[PDB]
Amino acid sequence: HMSVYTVKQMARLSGVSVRALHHYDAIGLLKPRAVGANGYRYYDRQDLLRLQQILFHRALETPLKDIQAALDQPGFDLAAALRAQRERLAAQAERYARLVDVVDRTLADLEGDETMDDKHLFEGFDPEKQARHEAWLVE
Amino acid sequence: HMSVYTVKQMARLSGVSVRALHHYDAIGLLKPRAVGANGYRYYDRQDLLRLQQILFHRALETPLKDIQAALDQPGFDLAAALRAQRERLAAQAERYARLVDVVDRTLADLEGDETMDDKHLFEGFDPEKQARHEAWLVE
């Protein structure tokens, strides 16, 4: 809330390194807002929430330049951004949980009479991740 | 089980493109084993299980060359490989579910008195994904 943090403290609190925070600072992505009377710069609550936004974007494989754009958007609403991120994180949790179900079904067939239909081997894989890989194979 | 598939059929069944399967074939990753009397090559059940292994590896961001190595390992046990993949897929599902919890806790603080401790903003992020990004920032 009123707490403010040096780079050393922000690293320890967030798990982002001092190296990364200096880089995020240099490129205008995350600049410590709070300034003391000694000219030192400190991360405040608003900076912590922006860094959390950066970590959510990276969890969701958003590329570094796209992050700046998304955060600096005029009329940026943090609660809206969080709800959109929730939906995409939930969908990733459901994909991974579906892929465990596929492993479970495959193991049981495999240690059973091996009668399970072939198509059931392949339900659950991310079509998006396949397109980005077939596109790569065309070099 | 006894079913065998052309490239066109294997694409339709698996969701992998004809382009990718020809590439997987060329580089020795997945070569249709079953051969007919007309010299044509067909994917059998064992090929379907190897392709499922490739799709699990790609879900778990294993690099293409590492896949060959892992599948061609002497004493390769498919049920062992599946159980190891289960554990890593489950862990990804738990990470994504934890990140939704973090969003939920943050939203409720944000629309509340904003008293939640700062450290709670940052629990749940993948430290591995952070190291691979701080390492990248050193170019």
Residue numbers in the entry:
A (entry chain A), B (entry chain A): 0 to 138
Could you pull the original sentences from the published paper?
As a result, diffraction-quality crystals of SkgA were obtained, and the structure was determined at a resolution of 2.5 Å using the single-wavelength anomalous dispersion phasing method. Although full-length SkgA (residues 1–255) protein was used for crystallization, only residues 1–138 were observed in the final structure. The established structure consists of the N-terminal MerR-type HTH motif, coiled-coil region, and the initial two α-helices of the C-terminal TipAS domain, whereas the rest of the TipAS domain was still invisible in the current model, probably because of structural flexibility or diffraction damage. Because MerR family proteins reportedly function as dimers and SkgA protein also exhibits a dimer conformation in solution, a dimeric SkgA structure was established by combining two molecules from two adjacent asymmetric units for subsequent analysis. Remarkably, apart from the coiled-coil α5 helices, the α6–α7 region and N-terminal domain are also involved in the dimeric interface. Fifteen residues of the α6–α7 region of each protomer interact with the N-terminal domain of the other protomer via hydrogen bonding, ionic bonding, and hydrophobic interactions, which contribute to stabilization of the conformation of the α6–α7 region. Eleven residues of the N-terminal α1–α2 region exhibit interactions with ten residues of the α6–α7 region via hydrophobic interactions and three hydrogen bonds formed by residue pairs Tyr4–Asp117, Ser16–Glu133, and Tyr23–His132.
